[PDB]
Each structure stands twice: as C-alpha cells, then as structure tokens.
Amino acid sequence: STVAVTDATFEADVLKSSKPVLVDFWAEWCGPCKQIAPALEQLSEELADVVTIAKVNIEDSPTTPSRYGVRGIPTMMLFRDGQMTSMKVGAMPKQKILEWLNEAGVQAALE
C-alpha cells in the first residue's frame, strides 16, 4: 500500500528515505488523479523493497508542492537521497511509469 505524506511528515517519509521515493501529488477533485490511483497501489506492492510510493494531497499539504514547483496534477516526482531527480505530469499508463522508473534507476547508477 502507499504511504500518505503530509507537510509535517515529508522530510522524514521522503527526504530522509534510504530508498527512492515516488511522490504523487493529487487532489480529491482531480479526475486523472483518480484514474492513476489504482495503478500506484499496484506499483506500491510490485515495487516493495525497491521504491516507496508516497501520496501527497495538495489541498491538505500546500507547502511541499509549492517548494517543488507543482503547477498541475497529477504530478509524479522521484526523490533520491533528499533530492528531486525527475518528474512526470498528467495521467500515464502503469507501464510508462515503470519505464520511467527503470530509466531513472539506470541513470542514477551511471552518475
């Protein structure tokens, strides 16, 4: 299952994580956000012990999206050792997100 992260818990759940985190920015009023919501509960379990998948609600926790320049939702951002390394805007098939995390993982290993 996915980790629900707030402004108060973001630095402990995400920036101090010992693993890549996929942070998903959403709002209860966005439709695409509800379209990809099942896909990320599947990736949460498929990628357990490899990638944490976090959900941040931009209406309850405004500071974290402000700090990273979110302009639309869904916005998915990958974090690695406290730093934001990549992002994807808009709804996206489950397999495109895997391809993106595979290439994020390859690129991080070669730097």
Element (H, E) at 43: helix 37-46
With 0-12 / 13-18 / 19 or more C-beta atoms within 10 angstroms meaning exposed / middle / buried, residue 8 is: exposed
Distances (CA, A) of 85 to 1, 20, 21, 44, 58: 23, 10, 10, 19, 20
45 is catalytic: no
Domains belonging to the chain, first-starting first, are 1-111 (3.40.30.10)
Q: How far apart are CA 72 and CA 15, in angstroms?
A: 22
Q: Is 33 a catalytic residue?
A: yes
Experimental method: X-ray
User: Which tokens in the block code for residue 93?
Assistant: 């098939």
Q: How far apart are CA 21 and CA 91, in angstroms?
A: 18
CA distances from 29 to 32, 47, 73 (A): 9, 27, 10
The secondary element (H helix, E strand) that includes residue 78 is strand 75-80
Candidates 22, 30, 40, 58; catalytic one: 30
| Residue of 5, 21, 33, 76 marked active site | 33
- To what resolution in angstroms was this structure determined? 2.8
- Can you say whether residue 49 is alpha, beta or left, with left for phi > 0 and alpha for psi between -120 and 50 degrees? left
Of 51, 55, 32, 48, nearest in space to 101 by CA = 51
